[PDB]
Amino acid sequence: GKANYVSLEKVRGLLLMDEFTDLDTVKVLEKLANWSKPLVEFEEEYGELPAQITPEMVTYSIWDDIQDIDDIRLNALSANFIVTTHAMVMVDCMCNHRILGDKENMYLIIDEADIFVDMLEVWKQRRFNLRELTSAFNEHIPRNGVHVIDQLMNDVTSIAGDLHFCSTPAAVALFDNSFNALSKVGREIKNEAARKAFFDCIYSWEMLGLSGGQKGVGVSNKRREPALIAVNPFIGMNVGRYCTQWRSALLTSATLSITSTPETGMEWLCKALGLTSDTISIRKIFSPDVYGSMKLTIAGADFPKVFNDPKEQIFSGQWLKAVVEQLSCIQGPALVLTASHYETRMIANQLGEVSQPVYIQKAGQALSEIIKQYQEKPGILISAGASVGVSPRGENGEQIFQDLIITRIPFLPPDRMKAESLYGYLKERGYSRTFEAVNRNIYLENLRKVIRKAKQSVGRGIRSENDTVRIIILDPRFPEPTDLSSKHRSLEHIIPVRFRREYRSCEILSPAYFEEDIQC
Amino acid sequence: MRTLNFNGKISTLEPLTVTVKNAVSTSGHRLPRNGGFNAAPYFPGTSIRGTLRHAAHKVIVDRVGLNADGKSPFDLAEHFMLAQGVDINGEAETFAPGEINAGAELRSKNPLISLFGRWGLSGKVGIGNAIPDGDNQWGMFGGGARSIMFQRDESLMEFLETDQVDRLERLLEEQAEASVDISQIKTEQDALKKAMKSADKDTKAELQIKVRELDEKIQARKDQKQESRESIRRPIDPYEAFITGAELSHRMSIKNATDEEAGLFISALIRFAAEPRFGGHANHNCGLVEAHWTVTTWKPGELVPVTLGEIVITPNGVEITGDELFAMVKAFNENQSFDFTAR
Amino acid sequence: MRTLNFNGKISTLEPLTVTVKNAVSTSGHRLPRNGGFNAAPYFPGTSIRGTLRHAAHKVIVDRVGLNADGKSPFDLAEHFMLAQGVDINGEAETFAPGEINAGAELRSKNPLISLFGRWGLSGKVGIGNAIPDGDNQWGMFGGGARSIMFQRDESLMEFLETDQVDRLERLLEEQAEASVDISQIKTEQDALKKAMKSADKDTKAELQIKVRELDEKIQARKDQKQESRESIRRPIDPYEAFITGAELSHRMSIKNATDEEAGLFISALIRFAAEPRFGGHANHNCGLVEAHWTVTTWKPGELVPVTLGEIVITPNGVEITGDELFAMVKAFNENQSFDFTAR
Amino acid sequence: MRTLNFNGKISTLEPLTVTVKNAVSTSGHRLPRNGGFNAAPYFPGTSIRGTLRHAAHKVIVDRVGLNADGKSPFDLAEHFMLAQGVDINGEAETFAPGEINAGAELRSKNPLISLFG
Amino acid sequence: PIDPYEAFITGAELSHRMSIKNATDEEAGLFISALIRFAAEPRFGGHANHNCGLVEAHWTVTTWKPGELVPVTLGEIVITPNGVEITGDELFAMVKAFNENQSFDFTA
DNA sequence: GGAGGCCAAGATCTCAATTTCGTACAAGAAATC
DNA sequence: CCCTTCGGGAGGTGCATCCCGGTCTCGCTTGGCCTCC
RNA sequence: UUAUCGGCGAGACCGGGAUGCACCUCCCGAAGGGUCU
């Protein structure tokens, strides 16, 4: 992904920084000072190399356009294949080959395409960074108006919070209000040419949002800068064009299947990327016939409701007590995967300090530190949505958790502005579907994202053919085997096809009264 | 003989409301819902269709002309035929099923009945429901409370003789005592309404009859109030309505619309624009709407429809674009062969 | 017999407020919201309608004239009919067939009732909501705190006898003790309701009757206080009102208005302009308005309205434009053939 | 029996301030804004009404006069009803029958309460 | 008081499965022409006084591979108020075949 | 004078009544246009 | 370089409507009669 | 899939009346000063 490798100048900064602390190994420093090699490979191979590998300073600065990004890119242009982060494939999207070059020569394997699309739904954004706009107009600056920009900059952080995109009603209201309160500033730029440039910029922003798609509030991934997000429909067609642009692209993932049938489980990605019948060359589901063992316990239709009043996100005390006792009833190392970090907070607090010491994913805490710490000392690991897939692998490649506990199905919150704004899209593009229809479509899309995420969660369970996982789904809404008409029946697709027999024969914690009804 | 699809939006100038017997219940007044309690309320196509049918009936009445005093040549039966499609005489020619070109003569000579139909005669005009655009856009309007005039301003009390002042005194004392008694009876009735939930069908029956006789007790208590039968001071229940400025997507169709029938429909829209009121609570000016429709015809067998023109109804006027709509209106206006009178 | 649309703006000379039961909640006085909770507030058309109806009632009372003592001929029932349209004698039937054609004569002889209908007679006048033009044009006003007179100013102590200063000392000590009691019980009630949040649905009712127990104990600690029922010192919760100078778009319709009915309406507008007070909070001078209306008419079948004139109500006077408005006012003033003592 | 509108201006000889409890964000003492954070602050009509009501109360007690020791004939409840508008002994009810048409005579006898209610 | 009738809500997404059995190009072309003419007045059911029945439907036209049990997607029939979007060259070929082959004798 | 079409007549009967509510989050990478 | 103040008191009541008015049909043959070929 | 095929449909304005208002002063206490052609 770049920005995480030798920066030349920061490696002459490293001369000074090490001599203060790493003086003993300054000789190895100069060995690094000369070989401008990607750090990532560097450490793992040279025996351990812990002396001078602290990442913070070895990396690019904010304005580190030192022309070395080309040099590694030119060096890596040759390859048998390119393991790398996604970035280039959408970073050279509209650079027009200024980064990667030849395209038809290259083939594309988008591994983990499920997360690719899921975060594409974020990348369908252009960050109207008021600090950048503040910084952009540093000569034609109506500084009196900066307060308005500053007040709005506060509001974005309040609504966006810790999210790069947030679908509360405030976000679109703040989007419209911010651009109206920026239109106020629009009549403050003194230079008329700059005023018209600013007016055209906001007008392009104004039409881009209202004409079609979704508006929102952003907090930039890096530097945590507030921003005003809105759809890039152009990018929405561009991604399809640019993946068809490759000679033959392959989207592959471990959870890119809502259902086990391709020809109905693949339409979420076909429609998301706008992909029509042209480029659907294969739709295949490949699963191992035997890979590890799965035992299933699912909370029956009587298990208390998770949210008593979900609007304020209050977890019903009956549910919290039942989940906590069930977790305490475990007898081995476990990976309790929650959906939110607040659920982690509540479970950790109510959990009465049971043995096999617990381990909690603090909001924002990088998972690497906690997972490595838990590897040495096993026990209950109460992770959250921050699990980001990966694996809680034991140090010598062995399963160090027997019990994957899904406290609740990670249901996505309602997006009452994504539905509204998408309805605006369909209305202005002429498509006639009522707002409730768009609400239903958004609900189904979110439920398919929940199915994919929970499939990822269950995939955390088994990684080696010898793995044995006791999956405990404590959500009451997970469909019972006997309830084939249950509302969230698609969630049954979370279990792999091969382990569906134990799904049918599964111990139910809190089942619902059956009988011997004579009219059988 | 074209199939005109009017696709458009009804922006709301004053709250749009309707009381439909099915939707409203004892919980309060609720707008007709798009299939469920937690559904988007929709303005019924029935109310829009009836308003447009009465507008077209008035158009036909004015076109046929008014006599010296102002009476139309149509009798009562003809007016009911034109406005509600009900034949009170029973002479209306029932079209026995299987009759080829059923009412083609009546359709030709009665454009209004051809548009809005009759019993056994299909109405070419289909007026669809007006669904809102965007979440919210409905709310509990009206509300408030009727207040004793003299207890709000004492200046209206200088206009009353002593006997009338004592009459007001008696009215207020009667209202207070009746309110106390009826409130006790209603508290007992509410205890029964809680007791419903143990609805053993026999106990459900007896409890319901008990609520019935408690209602009769309330009615008898209110019947023994000499001065005022009804409590003057009382909160007005709010009515659910679409907010002002609400955008309601609306679709109308005229199937197999002759130029005369479509001209009549456009003239009905023009006359409706004079008083563009839909629904009720018109005492609160509810129902005023500005609506813009795009008229698109679709020659069957063609992959795309062609937009004949646009009808925009606003408080500043009716703007009709497209020469086709003007030609249709002129064709309706210049045909003398409409025997709207019953056969 | 033409439709008159008063489309115009109300400028608020002083804050404009109203207290609708459904609109208000445990928070305090809040304007209706024009939709959901966060929707832009609107002034009820019901308050405007009631204010103008009582203005018209006073107009009719003055026009009929007052006897020497200053009393009006109208019966109390007639006053209620004219101003609030409630038949206290209960002789108003809703769908009595025989009044089907008596409606026209009743309207002709009672212009006010035709304008503002009654139960069974449709009101020709629809007074719409006033909706603000801009945003953030409302706010909380009236926030205050009743304070002991003799602690704000000490010169009022020299006017009280010894037994009355001792009375004030007993009152102050009862207020401080009551306060400590009601404050500790409400500081347990608020945390008990902050536990009702995470509540098992069944436990909702138990914590609810616990809340009602605490409320009964607050009301018995208040009924215990001898000196005072209510504590003199207290913060008055503010009410929500439209800001001063707020421009609210208003739309009023008189459907098929005869010259004399529209004249009565304009006379009602003038008499309301004498005291341009809307809503409530007569203390704090809330409700004062400066409203200007453009009266437009629309002959059915015409594609455009005709602006008859403008009705400007300002604190400096009532300006009437257009010969037609003057003609209607004069026609109402000169028509001596109105009877209001008989519905 | 006429409606008098005093329309006019207040010129501020010394700074004019008021601590409206709702208005004052604990951040700092802010004058009560005429809607939202950025509107024009106004002086509440409540404070002016209270000042004028206490002035009228003082006018009434001075016009009634005082005893040789300088004590107003009124009692504590009467003062509180006159100026604060609050009844000590609870003899104040709204929309109660029988006090109807006692408003005219009460207002005639008590011009202060008629004015300020 | 008019009794209510039970309908599907406006903007109800109803899953629809239609099939033609073994199909000469002419029969499939006639069916596609019937769909194209139904799109002129896309009305299903009665209560046409309230404009009931107006629908817009997207049909993915799949066929079976010769021999193999797998659906191949030949095109899409998107009937909307804005127009009929016949997609897929094969559907156009079927429509053209129906338009040609004028030897049909519908009489008897 | 035969062949179409419209309209009235013909035996009693078989059966059953819902009572609204979805879904409540995390972060992967970045020379961004 | 100082240093950001304590508190006080949060309502009392009213009144919650009356009434309409709930359809035709028709799933079959047959001849009698009334007009046309 | 014990055969082949059969749009259930046509018409209706639910509307008519009401001011929610009536009372409250949120005030009391203070020097920001000294320091350098």
Q: Which DSSP string do the residues of A98-116 spell out, in sequence order?
A: SSS---TT--EEEETHHHH
- Helices and strands: H and E segment counts in chain C: 9, 11
Give the long-range contacts of residues C187-194, CB within 8 A, separation 24 or more. C188/C214, C189/C214, C189/C215
Distance of alpha carbon C84 from the chain centroid = 13
* CB-count exposure of residue A455 (10 Å: 0-12, 13-18, 19+): buried
| Full DSSP string of C98-125 | GGTTHHHHHHHH-HHHHHS-BTTB--SE
Interface test with C, best of A159, A177, A308 (most C CBs within 10 A): A308
- State how far residue B42 is from chain E, nearest Cα, in angstroms: 9
- Scanning the structure block, which residue is given the tokens 């002759």? B258
Residues comprising chain C, all counted:
343
| C-alpha angle A206-A211-A212 in degrees, rounded to nearest 5 | 115
CA distance D2 to chain C (A): 10
Separation between Cα atoms, residue B276 and residue C264, nearest integer Å? 24
* C1: DSSP letter: -
Question: Which token pair is E6?
Answer: 């039970």
Q: What letters, b where the CB count within 10 A reaches 16 and e where it falls short, cover B23-62?
A: bbeeeebbbbbbeeeeebbbbbbbbbbbbbbbbbbbbbbe
Per the structure block, which two tokens stand in for C2? 């033409």
Count CB neighbours of E24 within 10 A: 13
DSSP letters, B234-293, are EEPPEEEEEPTT-EEEEEEEEEEE-HHHHHHHHHHHHHHHHS-B-BS-GGGTTTBEEEEE
Q: Encoding tokens for residue C243?
A: 């800001």
Residue found under tokens 């022409």: E33
Say if C38 is an interface residue toward chain A (CB within 8 Å): yes
Which residue has tokens 């540093």?
Answer: A138
How many whole angstroms from its chain centre is CA D94? 19
DSSP-derived pairing of the beta strands A249-252 and A108-111: parallel
Paired residues of B296 in beta bridges: B5, B307
Cβ proximity of A339 and A449 under 8 Å: no
Residues 78-107 of C with CB under 7 A from strand G: 94-95
Residues 103-132 of C with CB under 7 A from strand G: 119
Q: Tell me if residue D105 falls in helix, strand or coil.
A: helix
What is the residue type of E66? P
Q: Using an 8 Å CB-CB cutoff, list chain B residues near C83.
A: 149, 156
Which residues in E lie closer than 8 A to residue A263 (C-beta atoms)?
71
Q: Tell me, what DSSP letter sits at residue E65? A: P
Q: Which two tokens stand for residue D37?
A: 């954070």
Residue A297, SS3 per DSSP: strand
Of all residues in chain B, the one with the smallest CA distance to A440 is B39
For residue A216 the two structure tokens come to 């929102």
Count Cβ atoms below 10 Å from residue C143 Cβ, excluding itself: 20
Q: Are E97 and E19 in contact (CB under 8 A)?
A: no
The separation between CA C330 and the C-alpha centre of its own chain, rounded to angstroms, equals 30
Compute CA distances A50 → A18, A39, A183, B104, B221, whole Å. 12, 12, 53, 95, 93
User: How far apart (Å, rounded) are the C-alpha atoms in residues A197 and A204?
Assistant: 10
Tell me the one-letter amino acid at E5. Y
The CA distances from residue C140 to C36, C240, D21, in Å, are 19, 4, 11
Q: Which of D1, D100, D103 comes nearest B168 by C-beta?
A: D100
**Residue C51: closest CA among chain B residues belongs to which residue?**
B149
CA A180, A185, A186, A187 torsion-angle sign: positive
| Burial status of residue B68 (CB atoms within 10 A of its CB: 0-12, 13-18, 19 or more) | exposed
Residue B334 makes CB contacts below 8 A (sequence gap 6+) with none
What's this structure's resolution in Å? 2.9
Pairing mode, if any, of strands B317-321 and B306-314? antiparallel
Residue type, A504: R
| Phi, psi angle pair for A38, to nearest 5° | -55, 125
Residue with tokens 């009562």: B76
Separation of C263 CA and H21 C1' (Å): 29
D62 min Cα distance to partner chain B (Å): 29
- CB atoms D80 and C232 under 8 Å: yes
Q: Where are the alpha helices (DSSP H) in chain D?
A: 45-64, 76-79, 102-109, 111-116
Residues with Cβ within 8 Å of A281's Cβ and at least 6 positions away in sequence, in order, are none
Length B198 CA → F19 C1' (Å): 15
- Name the amino acid, one letter, at B90: G
> How far apart (Å, rounded) are the C-alpha atoms in residues A441 and A419?
8
Backbone angles phi, psi at A314, to 5 degrees: -100, 125
Q: At what angle do helices B45-64 and B259-274 cross, to 10 degrees?
A: 100
| Nearest neighbour of C199 by CB, restricted to A169, A308, A312 | A308
CA B133 to chain centre: 21
Do D95 and B148 form a contact (C-beta atoms < 8 A)?
yes
Nearest nucleotide, CA B230 to C1': G17
Closest CA to C206 of C221, C217, C195, C220: C195
Phi, psi at residue A184, to the nearest 5°? -55, -50
Q: Tokens representing A89? A: 């494939």
CB B17 within 8 A of CB C129: no
CA distance A121 to A494: 22
Nearest to C39 among B58, B139, B270 (CB): B139
Contact present, C152 and C145 (Cβ < 8 Å) = no
Question: Radius of gyration (Cα) for chain C, nearest Å?
Answer: 26
Nearest-angstrom CA–CA distance, E37 and B298: 9
**Closest protein residue to F6 using CA and C1' atoms?**
B96
d(CA A432, CA E51): 15
Phi, psi angles (nearest 5°) of residue A3: 65, 5
Residue C135 neighbours by CB under 8 Å, 6+ apart = C40
Q: How far apart are CA D42 and CA D76, in angstroms?
A: 33
- Say if E14 is an interface residue toward chain A (CB within 8 Å): no
According to DSSP, the β-strands at C289-297 and A381-383 are unpaired
DSSP character at residue D83: I
Q: Burial, A128: exposed, middle or buried (Cβ in 10 Å; 0-12, 13-18, 19+)?
A: buried
Q: What three-state secondary structure class fits E72? A: strand
Q: Which residue, among C67, C288, C72, has the nearest Cα to D3 in the 3D structure?
A: C288
Contacting residues for A266 by C-beta, under 8 A, at least 6 apart: A256, A257, A280, A283
Distance CA A11, CA A36 (A): 9
Q: Is B312 on the interface with E (CB under 8 A)?
A: no
**For residues A16 and A419, what is the distance between their CA atoms, to the nearest angstrom?**
55
Rg (CA), chain E: 17
The residue whose two tokens read 């209110």 is B222
What residues form DSSP beta bridges with C254?
Answer: C4, C125
List, in sequence order, every residue forming a beta bridge with A309; answer none if it has no partner. A314
> What span, in angstroms and rounded, lies between the C-alpha atoms of C16 and C277?
9
Q: Which residues contact C302 (CB under 8 A, 6 or more apart)?
A: B274
Beta pairing partners, C277:
C288
| Selected residues 96-155 of chain C with any CB under 8 Å from a CB in chain D | 136-146, 148-149, 152-153
Looking at residue B116, what DSSP letter applies?
A: H
| List of chain A residues whose C-beta atoms are within 8 Å of the C-beta of residue B135 | 416, 419-420, 435, 439
- Amino acid code (one letter) for A415: D
Question: A1 and A84 in contact (C-beta within 8 Å)?
Answer: yes
Number of neighbouring beta carbons within 10 Å of residue C64: 15
- Among residues A280, A299, A269, which one has the least CA distance to residue A448? A269
Which two three-digit tokens encode residue A10? 């920061």
Cα–Cα distance between D52 and D46 in angstroms, integer? 10
Give the span between the Cα atoms of E9 and E12, in whole angstroms: 5
Angle, CA of B264, B270 and B274, to the nearest 5°: 140
Q: Are the beta carbons of C248 and C132 closer than 8 angstroms?
A: yes
> Which residues in C lie closer than 8 A to residue B263 (C-beta atoms)?
none
Contacts of E69 (CB under 8 A, 6+ apart): none
Apex D81 CA angle, D76 and D84, nearest 5: 100
Asked if strand G comes closer than 7 Å to E49 Cβ, the answer is no
Which residues is chain A interrupted after (C–N above 2.5 Å)? none
CA A77 to chain CA centroid, Å, is 28
Which residues lie closer than 8 Å to D9 by C-beta, 6 or more apart?
none
Q: Which single residue is written with the structure tokens 């409370």?
A: B145
Closest nucleotide (C1' vs CA) to A387 is: F26
- Specify the experimental method: cryo-EM
Contacts of D5 in chain C (CB under 8 A): 315
Residues 6+ apart with CB under 8 A from C3: B274, B275, C253, C254, C255, C256, C257, C297, C298, C300
CB A159 within 8 A of CB A171: yes
> Can you tell me the distance from the alpha carbon of B46 to that of B54, in angstroms, rounded to the nearest whole number?
12
Residue type, D98: G
Q: How far apart are CA A478 and CA C200, in angstroms?
A: 22
H-helix segments, A78-220? 87-91, 113-123, 130-136, 143-160, 169-186, 192-211
Asked if C30 contacts C39 with a C-beta cutoff of 8 angstroms, the reply is no
E12 touches chain A (CB under 8 A): yes
Residue pair B321/B310 in contact by the 8 Å Cβ criterion: yes
Indicate yes or no: strand G within 7 A of the C-beta of C165.
Answer: no
User: How crowded is residue B146: how many other Cβ atoms within 10 Å of its Cβ?
Assistant: 18
Contact D45, C284 (CB under 8 A): yes
* Count of CB atoms situated within 10 Å of the CB of C191: 10
Nearest CA-CA partner of D80 in B300, B227, C146: C146
Task: Enter the tokens of residue A491.
Answer: 């969630």
